[PDB]
Amino acid sequence: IVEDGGHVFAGQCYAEIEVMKMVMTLTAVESGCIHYVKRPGAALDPGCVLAKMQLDNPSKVQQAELHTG
Amino acid sequence: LRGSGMIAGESSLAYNEIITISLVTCRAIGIGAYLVRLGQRTIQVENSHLILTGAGALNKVLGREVYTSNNQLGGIQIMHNNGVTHCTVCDDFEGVFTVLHWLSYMPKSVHSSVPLLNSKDPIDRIIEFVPTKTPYDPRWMLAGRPHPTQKGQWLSGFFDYGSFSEIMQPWAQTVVVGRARLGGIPVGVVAVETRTVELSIPADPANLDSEAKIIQQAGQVWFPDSAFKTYQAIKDFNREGLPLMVFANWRGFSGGMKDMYDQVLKFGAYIVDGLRECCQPVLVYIPPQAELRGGSWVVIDSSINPRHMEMYADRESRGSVLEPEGTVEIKFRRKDLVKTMRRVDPVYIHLAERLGTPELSTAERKELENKLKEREEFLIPIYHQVAVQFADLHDTPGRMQEKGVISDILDWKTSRTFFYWRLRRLLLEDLVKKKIHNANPELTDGQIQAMLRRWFVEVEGTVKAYVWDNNKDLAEWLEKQLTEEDGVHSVIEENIKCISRDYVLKQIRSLVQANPEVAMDSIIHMTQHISPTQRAEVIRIL
C-alpha cells in the first residue's frame, strides 16, 4: 500500500494480504525509508524476507561468524 | 389417522397445483406442522413454537429436565435461521400485511396472466449506483441507496424503488433470492453475496461436546444450503409461473471436506431436474467484474431448456471452463517462460546471441550463464503475471457469440431498458406459443417457433423482416392483434382454427384406420345434422 523510497512510522500499516481467504493488516513496526523487495502476488512461507528499510536511528554493530568445526 | 394421511396426499398434490401458504400463530403440533411445511410458504408470529412431542415427555424419556420451553426447539430463531419459515412477523396483522403484499405479485389463477401495473418508476431511466470489482453490499445494487452527501436523494438500484421484498434473509446469506417488480412486472430475482459471511452454529445442549462454531463462508460459491435454498425458491416461483432474472457471479463449487461430506453434489443434481421442469423464461446475466467458471456455466447453459433460457454478458464480465491460474499451471511452465524471453526480451536475446559465439573460455561461459540465470530468475514472477493476463484474454464474449452460445453483449448503463422490453416480448411471444400449443399439442417446439414468424412476414412483407428484431414494434403490434375481439385482428386465430381443423381430421382419420368397424355407425351420428344440399351431393359422389 506504499511505494519504494517512502518514509514510514512505527505501527503504520504497510501492506495488506489475503490469507486463508481472509485479510491481514501487515503493520509496519519501525520508522524509516522502505525499499519494497519481494514483488507482490507470490506465495510466501513464515520467516521469509519481504523488504529492507533504511531506518533513522542506526544502532550497534552486528554479526561476524567465525566458527568452523 | 386415515383422514390425516388422506389430506397429506391431497395437500402434496395441491402444492403441485396451486399456491399454498401457512401461518403459525400460537403453536403447530404434529400433523399441523406437517401441513405447514407442505404449504411450504410459511409466516411465523413471535412467541409461537413448532413441535412434535412435548418437552415433558422428552425430558422424562431422557431422564432429566433438559428443556424448559418449546420455543427452545421450534421458535423463529430456528425456522427463520434455517429457511423453514419464510417470513417472521410481530403480530397477525403484520402477517396478513405480508400475505397481501406477496399476493400483489401473483396471478389470480393458473389460467391467467400475471397482473400488470402502470408503475410510477419510468423504464428509460439510468441506474446511479455502479457495481465494482471491490466487494459491495448488493442491496445498494438492487434497491438503491441514499446518496452519501446530499442524503435526501436516493442512489437508484437496478430495480424499482421500494419494490424489492426479500426472502430467506437470515439463512445461508452467501446468496440472496427474492421477488421484485420491474416497471410493475413481477419477477423472480437471484443475486450473489460478495463479502465473506460470518455464520453462527448453535450449541447442542444435549451433547456437552458440541460447541457453537463460527465459520467463514467465501463469496461467489454455491454450498449445500445455498443449493437447497435455491432449489426450493426456483421451484416455488416456477410453480407460480414467473420469469427469472439472475445476476450471475459464481467462481465454482466449494470442494472442501465438509461440503463434500455434506452432499452438495446431490442438491446440484436436484436443481438440474427442477429447472428442466421449468416452463417460463429464465434470463441469466453475468454483471461487470463478475466471473463464471466451469461447472456453474455447464449447469446453467441455455441448452438445458432452449425453449425458455437466455444468457447475457457485460463487456466487463468473464467466463470459462477454467480460471487463469489453473490453466497456467498446466499450459505455462518454466520452458514457456524461457521460450518467451527468447522471442521477445532484448536482454535475453542479446545475451543468448553472445553465448551463441564460438571459442569462449569456460570461465566466460559460466559467468555469462550465471548472469543470465540471475536476470531470468529475477524476471520470472512478472512474466508469470503477463502469462495469466494472456490466458485471461481467451475468455471474452466475442468468441462465445461467434460460436453462438451467448445471445448478446450488453452495456450496463442501458441494460435495464433492454431487458424490460426484451423480456416483455419474449414473455408475450411465449404466452402466444402456449396458446398455439393448446391449439395443437403434437407440434414440436421448432415448428411452433416456425410459422408464427412466417405468418408475420407474409402479412407485413419480406421487406419488413428486420422489424422482428425490434422488441417494441412487434410488442405494440402483437397487442392490437390480441386485444381487439371480433375485429379484423382474429387472423392468426382464424389460421389456428384451420390448423385445429386439420389436427382433428388427422385424429378421426387415424382412429378409423385403426378401427374400421366403427365407420358405419359413426356416419349415422355424423349424418344426424348436415345440410340437405350436402345430402344430395353425397348421393351424387356415391
Add this chain to the structure above:
Amino acid sequence: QSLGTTYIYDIPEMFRQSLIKLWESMSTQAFLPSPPLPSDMLTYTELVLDDQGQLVHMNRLPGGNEIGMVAWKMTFKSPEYPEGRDIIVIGNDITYRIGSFGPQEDLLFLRASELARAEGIPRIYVSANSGARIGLAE
C-alpha cells in the same frame, strides 16, 4: 388473547382494514384509480358441512360452529385485480376441544381443499392447534 393468539372470527375485518393500508402504500409505486369503498371491497361466504360431509354456502352469524375449524371463500377487488379475485382461507378455532383434530375437522379440510383445487386458486391455512384428538373411555 389470554392464550396469546387471535380469535378466529375477528380475522376478516382486520384483513379488510389492512387492505386499506395497502391501497395507500401501493399508490406510492403506481398510478392507481381511487380506492373503492370498504363495504364494496370484499364479500365472503362461510363454508359449512352438511350431514353428508358435503359443502354448503352459508351466511350465518359468527359463533355457530360445532367444530374447531372455520373456512370461507373470499372475493375481493385489489389494485392489481380491481375486477376481483378469489382465495380460500381456513383457520383453527382453539376454543373447541383445545383445537384438537377430529374427523369432522379433517373432513371439512378435505372438502374445502378439494374445491380449492377445483377452481385452481390458492389455499391459506392458519395453524394454531393441539394435534389429533385423543380420549379414553371414561
Add this chain to the structure above:
Amino acid sequence: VAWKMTFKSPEYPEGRDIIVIGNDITYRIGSFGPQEDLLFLRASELARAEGIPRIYVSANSGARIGLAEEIRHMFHVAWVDPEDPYKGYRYLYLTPQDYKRVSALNSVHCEHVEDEGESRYKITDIIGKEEGIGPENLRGSGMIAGESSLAYNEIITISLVTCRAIGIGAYLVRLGQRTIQVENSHLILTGAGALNKVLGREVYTSNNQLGGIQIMHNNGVTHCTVCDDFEGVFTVLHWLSYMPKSVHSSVPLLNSKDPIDRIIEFVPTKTPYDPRWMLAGRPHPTQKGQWLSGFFDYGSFSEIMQPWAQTVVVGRARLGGIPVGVVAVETRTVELSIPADPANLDSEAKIIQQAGQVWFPDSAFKTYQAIKDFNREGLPLMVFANWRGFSGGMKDMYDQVLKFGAYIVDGL
C-alpha cells in the same frame, strides 16, 4: 466408445438389451470434445427410444483445455517502458507481418494503432482457430445434463468410476444415481494442488481423502464399492438379475429352489436383533450345518447403502424368485463416526449413539431415494414397519428433517 449389446440370461433366456458407453483415457487423456459429447447424446437418445438401460463407464480427466501454440510462439509485448518492465504493461501486439495471416482466419481480433512511431496491432479478442477447446463443450455438456436427467426419469441408468471421474463426469454419474466405485479411485472437481495454493499451503496430499469409497460409500453418494472392474461387473449382472428388461415388460419370474409353503424358524423378540437374520436367516447355534431360515429366499438378499445411515437397512431380495424391494429397521443403537475436518484445526470428529426405531435425516433422505428409484423402476415394496417416532433433537431439526419427510410423502 459405445455398443449396443444383447444377451440371453437365466431370467430372460430369449434376450435383453442395454447400451454401454465408456471413456478411453488414452485419447487425449480422456478429454471431452464435441464429438465425444455427441456420441453420448445420440446413444442416449436411442436408449430413450427403446426404454432400455444406459451404462456409463467414467474414467477421465474432464473438459478439454488448450491454448493456441501458434500464437504463443509469435506474440509481442507493448511495454510501458523497456528499461523497466515492472512498472506494468499496457498490451500485447503483432507486427503487420504476423497479423496479415491470422487476420484472414478468424483467430484473433485486433485493432491497428500507431504508437511510438511504429504501427502495432493491439489484441482485443482471442477467438482461437482450434476447434474443440472452447465453450461448445459447455453447450454440449448442458445438453446432456438435461437429456441425462430425462434418461434417469425414463430408464435405469448406472455408472462405474474405475480410476477417476472429474467434474461433469461426476455430475453425469450422480444423475445416473446408481453408482459403483472401484477401490483406489477418486472423485473431485478441483485438484488438491489448486486448492492448497489458494489456501497458501499443502493442506491435502491425495484425492482419496476427498472422493474415495470411504467418503462416498459412507455418505450414500456411492451405491456399491468393488475391488476391481471384474467384481463391479459381477455385481452389475447380479443386480440386473432382479430387474425387468424394459418398462413395457413384466417382472421376470424364476422357478426357485426355496419352496413357498415352508415355515420361518426365527421368531422376533422384544430384544434387538440383526434384521439380516430376520430376512435371510442365520446359522443354527447348535447344529451349525443347519440354517435358521429367514423370511425371504435363501441367498437372495442383496443390500445397498450398507455403511451409511445404519439405523435403517434397505436392499433387494427375491420371494420365490420374484425380485422385490425391501425395507427394514435397525433396532440396536448405531455408533456413528463423524470425521474431523483437517482444514479447520478446531473441528473434531464426534461419535454419536443412534437409537433404534427412529427415522433420522439421513435415514429419511436415503429412504426417499430408495423408494423413488425402485418406484420409478416398477418394483414391489416390502416394508417391515417398526417405528416409535421421529427424532426431534436440535441437530436434526436444524438440519431440516421435516422437509425430507414432506419429500417422502410426495414420492409415495
Add this chain to the structure above:
Amino acid sequence: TEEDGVHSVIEENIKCISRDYVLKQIRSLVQANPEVAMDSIIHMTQHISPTQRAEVIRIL
C-alpha cells in the same frame, strides 16, 4: 395365456368398450365442431360395405 382362443372374452368385451369410448369421443368432437363433420364423412365413407351405402340412401 391362450392367444386367439375362446378365452379372450373379457378382452373382447373390453374391445367393445374401447369401440364405444372412441365413438363417444368422435361424437363429442362433432358436437363441439359440427362444421368439420361433412368432409370427415367423405374420408369415413371411403370404404364401407355397398349394402350399407344403399341402406343409407334408403334411410336418408
